[PDB]
Amino acid sequence: NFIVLDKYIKAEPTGDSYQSESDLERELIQDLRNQGYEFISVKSQSAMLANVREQLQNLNGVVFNDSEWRRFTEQYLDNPSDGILDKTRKIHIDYICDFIFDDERLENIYLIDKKNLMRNKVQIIQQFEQAGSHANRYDVTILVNGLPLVQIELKKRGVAIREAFNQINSLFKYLQLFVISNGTDTRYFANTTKRDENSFDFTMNWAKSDNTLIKDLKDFTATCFQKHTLLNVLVNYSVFDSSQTLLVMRPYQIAATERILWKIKSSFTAKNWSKPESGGYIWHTTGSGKTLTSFKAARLATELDFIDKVFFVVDRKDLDYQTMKEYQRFSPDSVNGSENTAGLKRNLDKDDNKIIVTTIQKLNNLMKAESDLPVYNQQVVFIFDECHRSQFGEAQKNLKKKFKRYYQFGFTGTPIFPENALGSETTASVFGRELHSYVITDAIRDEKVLKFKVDYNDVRPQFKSLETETDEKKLSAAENQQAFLHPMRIQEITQYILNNFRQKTHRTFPGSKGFNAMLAVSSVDAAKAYYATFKRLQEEAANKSATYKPLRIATIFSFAEISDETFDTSAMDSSAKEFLDAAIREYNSHFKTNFSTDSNGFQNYYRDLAQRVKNQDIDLLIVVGMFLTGFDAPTLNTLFVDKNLRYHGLMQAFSRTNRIYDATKTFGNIVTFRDLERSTIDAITLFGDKNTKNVVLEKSYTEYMEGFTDAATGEAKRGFMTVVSELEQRFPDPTSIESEKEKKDFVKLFGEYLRAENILQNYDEFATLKALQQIDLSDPVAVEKFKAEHYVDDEKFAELQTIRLPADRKIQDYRSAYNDIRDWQRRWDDVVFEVDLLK
Ligand SMILES: Nc1ncnc2c1ncn2[C@@H]1O[C@H](COP(=O)(O)OP(=O)(O)OP(=O)(O)O)[C@@H](O)[C@H]1O
Numbered sequence: 001n002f003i004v005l006d007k008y009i010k011a012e013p014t015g016d017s018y019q020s021e022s023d024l025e026r027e028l029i030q031d032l033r034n035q036g037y038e039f040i041s042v043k044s045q046s047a048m049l050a051n052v053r054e055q056l057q058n059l060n061g062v063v064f065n066d067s068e069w070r071r072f073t074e075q076y077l078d079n080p081s082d083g084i085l086d087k088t089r090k091i092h093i094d095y096i097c098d099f100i101f102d103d104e105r106l107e108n109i110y111l112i113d114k115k116n117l118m119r120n121k122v123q124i125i126q127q128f129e130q131a132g133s134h135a136n137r138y139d140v141t142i143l144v145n146g147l148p149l150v151q152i153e154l155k156k157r158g159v160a161i162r163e164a165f166n167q168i169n170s171l172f173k174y175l176q177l178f179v180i181s182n183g184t185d186t187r188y189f190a191n192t193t194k195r196d197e198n199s200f201d202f203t204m205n206w207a208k209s210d211n212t213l214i215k216d217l218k219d220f221t222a223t224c225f226q227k228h229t230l231l232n233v234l235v236n237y238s239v240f241d242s243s244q245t246l247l248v249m250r251p252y253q254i255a256a257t258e259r260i261l262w263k264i265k266s267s268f269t270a271k272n273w274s275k276p277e278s279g280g281y282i283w284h285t286t287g288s289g290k291t292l293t294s295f296k297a298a299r300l301a302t303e304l305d306f307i308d309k310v311f312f313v314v315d316r317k318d319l320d321y322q323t324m325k326e327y328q329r330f331s332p333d334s335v336n337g338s339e340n341t342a343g344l345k346r347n348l349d350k351d352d353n354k355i356i357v358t359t360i361q362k363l364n365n366l367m368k369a370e371s372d373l374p375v376y377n378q379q380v381v382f383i384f385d386e387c388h389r390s391q392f393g394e395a396q397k398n399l400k401k402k403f404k405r406y407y408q409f410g411f412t413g414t415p416i417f418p419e420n421a422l423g424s425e426t427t428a429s430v431f432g433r434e435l436h437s438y439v440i441t442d443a444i445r446d447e448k449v450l451k452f453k454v455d456y457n458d459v460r461p462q463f464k465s466l467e468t469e470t471d472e473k474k475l476s477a478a479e480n481q482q483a484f485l486h487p488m489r490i491q492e493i494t495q496y497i498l499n500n501f502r503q504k505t506h507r508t509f510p511g512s513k514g515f516n517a518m519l520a521v522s523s524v525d526a527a528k529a530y531y532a533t534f535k536r537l538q539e540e541a542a543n544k545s546a547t548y549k550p551l552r553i554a555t556i557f558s559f560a561e562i563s564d565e566t567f568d569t570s571a572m573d574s575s576a577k578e579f580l581d582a583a584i585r586e587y588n589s590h591f592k593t594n595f596s597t598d599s600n601g602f603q604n605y606y607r608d609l610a611q612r613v614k615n616q617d618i619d620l621l622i623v624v625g626m627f628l629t630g631f632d633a634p635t636l637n638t639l640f641v642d643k644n645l646r647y648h649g650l651m652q653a654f655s656r657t658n659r660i661y662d663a664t665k666t667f668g669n670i671v672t673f674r675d676l677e678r679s680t681i682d683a684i685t686l687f688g689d690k691n692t693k694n695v696v697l698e699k700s701y702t703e704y705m706e707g708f709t710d711a712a713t714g715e716a717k718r719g720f721m722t723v724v725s726e727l728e729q730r731f732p733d734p735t736s737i738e739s740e741k742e743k744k745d746f747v748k749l750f751g752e753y754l755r756a757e758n759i760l761q762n763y764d765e766f767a768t769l770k771a772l773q774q775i776d777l778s779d780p781v782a783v784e785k786f787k788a789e790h791y792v793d794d795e796k797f798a799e800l801q802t803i804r805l806p807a808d809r810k811i812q813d814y815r816s817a818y819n820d821i822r823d824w825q826r827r828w829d830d831v832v833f834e835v836d837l838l839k
C-alpha cells in the first residue's frame, strides 16, 4: 500500500464554519477520530504517564508494578538529563529497553513496534488550559503508544502560514513530527536538536505521487494522517543519521523509495530477477536529496527477508566529509578513493549484515578480480546513487555477467538520453522503467532547490572571440598561454572575482556572515595560473591598503564533459605535482594541519578541504573536475566558471549552488567567463521541456528594477524602483507612524523593498549603481577608478547619476521602524515580516 497516492480524490468542505482555530481543530479532531485515532482527555503529565504505562504494557504483553514502572520511567522513558536529541535517538535506534523486573527476570520493552506498525496505538489530545490569561495556542497532539510524537499547530484562515512558523513537560521532548496549518495550507517539518534551526524553506507540503501539492488541512488529514501513512512517515521514512539530525523525507523521496521496494517484492515473487524489467531508475533533479533517499531505500531494502545482500554504490567523485563519516557505521574503511577490494571482501563475509556500502570503482575491481563469489549466487539488490559514466559501463558488463539474481536501481538528476549519450548507454536501457520522477520544474515550484542566475561576464574585448568560440577543435586547441591562459585574461578574470566576491556572496552588508564560492577552471595549468594570480593580486592589494582583508583560497586537482580525477597522485606530472605540493603546504601553514601528497595524505586533504569549504573556513575553492558533482554545501552561493561545460556536466556543476538555505539565499550565482548561454539552454532543455529555461533561469536586472509579470498565475510583480517611489511618496517617516493602517502598508511595501534589494545584490548593474553613490568629489581620479572597475562608459556614467535612490540614513530609519513594528506585534493576519533579511 503506497503511502504516496497515485490517485486521490479531493475532499469536499463540510459547509460548517472553517474560519477560526477552534473550527479547524474541531474538524481535525473529528476527522482523525474517523481515521481511527481515539480522543482521550488528558490534562496533565501524570495522566500522560498513566496512559503511556497502559499502552506500553499492552504492546509488550507485560505488566509493571508501581516500583518497576517508576524505575523504567526514571531510567529509560522520562530521565531528566534526556534532551530532544536523546528522545529522538531513543525513538529511532534505542527504542528497545531491556528491563529487569523486581523478580529479576529480563524482558525487552518496545516503545514502538517497527516490524508491525498497525499494532501501535494511536490517540489524539488537545492543549492544556494552563493558568492566567495569555492563550491562544491551539494544538492537537498525536500520541503513538502514549508518546506525543506529532504536533499540529492550528491558525485561522487569514493567517499567513509562514509568519505563523516564524512565531515558533518532559514527555513532549518525544515530539518528532511538526505540522502547522491555517487550513488553506498545511506544512510539516522535523523536530530538531540543532543550536542553529532550519528555516521555513525546509518545511514540506504533503503530495501525491505526481508531486502535485496537497494543501488544505482536510486533504492533508485524509492522506498524510492515515494511520498507515503517518506511522510509516514517522518510523520508516524519517532519518536519524550519524550527525544525530532528524530529517523527514519529502513526499517524492518516499514515493521513489516505496516504489523501489514494491518493485523488488514483485520482481522476486515473479522470479523476474536480473533483467532491466526487474529493476528501475529514479530521476530526481540535482540537489533534491538523491543520496539521503537512495541510502534510506537501500537500508529499507535490507528489511526484505528474501533479500540476502543490498549494495549501496556511490561515486568517490560525489563523496564529501559527512557522507564518508556516515558510511563508517556500516562498512568501516571500505568506502574511499582507493582501488582496494579488501574492505569490500570483509563486508561480504560479515555476519548479521545485509547492507554493503561501496564505490563503483571498488565494485568493478572486485567483479574483475574475483571469479566465483558466494554473493554472486545470492539474492542481491543494487542501489546506485549518481554513478558517473566513468567505470559504470564496464562495471555493468561484469555485473550482468557474474551476478545471477539481482534487482538494480538507478538514481540520477541527469539521466542518459540518446542526445547526451556520448559513448554511454541510455539510463532507460540499463535500468529499465522509470519508477518515479521529480523534475527540476517541480523542484523549483516547491522551492526545494534554488533557481540559477547565469551570466556570461563580458568585459574583455581581446579574449571575447575565444570565450564565444563554438568550434570544438578550436576550443580544445585554445588552452595555453597564447589563447585562454593568456596572463592578461587570467589577470582580468581574477581581478573581477576579487573585486566582486563579497558582492556575489552577500558579504556586502556590515555584520553579515554571507556565503562562499567556487572557481571551476579548464585545466591543471588553469588552476595553477589562477591560484598564482590570486596570490599575487591579493598581495598587491594588501600592499596598497592596510585595511584590506584577504580571501582564503584553496585548490585541489588530480591526474584525470567532466573528467574523473583519480585519488592517485603518482599519475600526475612533476610540475602539477610540485604546485599541488606547494598549495597543500600553504593550506597546512594556515590551517595548522599536516597533509602529505601521498595518496592517503591527499585523500585526507580532500576530506578536510571538503569540510572547510562546507563550513566557509575557505572563501574560494579552485577546482578542475573535483567537487563539481555530489558536493553538498548549502552555504555556497556562487560558481565562477572559466570552463567548457555541456549538458549533464553543466547541470551538475551549476547545482553546487542550488541548495536551499534561507531567505538570504535567493538563488545560485553562476558567473561564467566563457559564453555558456547556448550550453545552459541546451542542457536545461534536455532535462526539462522547451519552457524549463523560463523557470530555472532568473529574470533580468531591468525586470527586477522596473517590474515584471510571472507566467504561472499572472501575478504582476512590482519593480524595485516602484517600491522606492511609493516609499518616498507614501511614507517618508517618522510621522507615517503611529497609525496602524499605515504601519501595515509600510510593513508590506518595505518587505517588498527588502526582498527586491536582496535579489538585486547579485546583479553587477545594481552593484555598480550602489557603488556610484559615494563618491566624491570630484575627484577624477575618483571617476576613472569607478569606471574602470565597474566597466562603465562616460555615457552610462552620465545616465547612472539620473537614477535617484534613498539615502542610507533613510533606509536605516525604515529598517529600525520595521524592527520596532515587528517588536510591537507579539502581544495583521496575512502580513509576513522578513525575519532572515533583518538578521
Ligand atoms: N527530507 C529532507 N529534509 C531536510 N533536508 C533534506 C531532505 N532531503 C535532502 N535534504 C538536504 O538537501 C541537501 C541535498 O541533499 P543530497 O546531498 O542528498 O542531494 P543530492 O541530490 O544527492 O545531491 P546531488 O544531486 O547534488 O549529487 C542536503 O544538505 C540535505 O541535508
Ligand SMILES: [Mg+2]
Pocket (backbone or CB within 6 Å): 289, 290, 291, 318, 385, 386, 630
Ligand atoms: Mg547524490
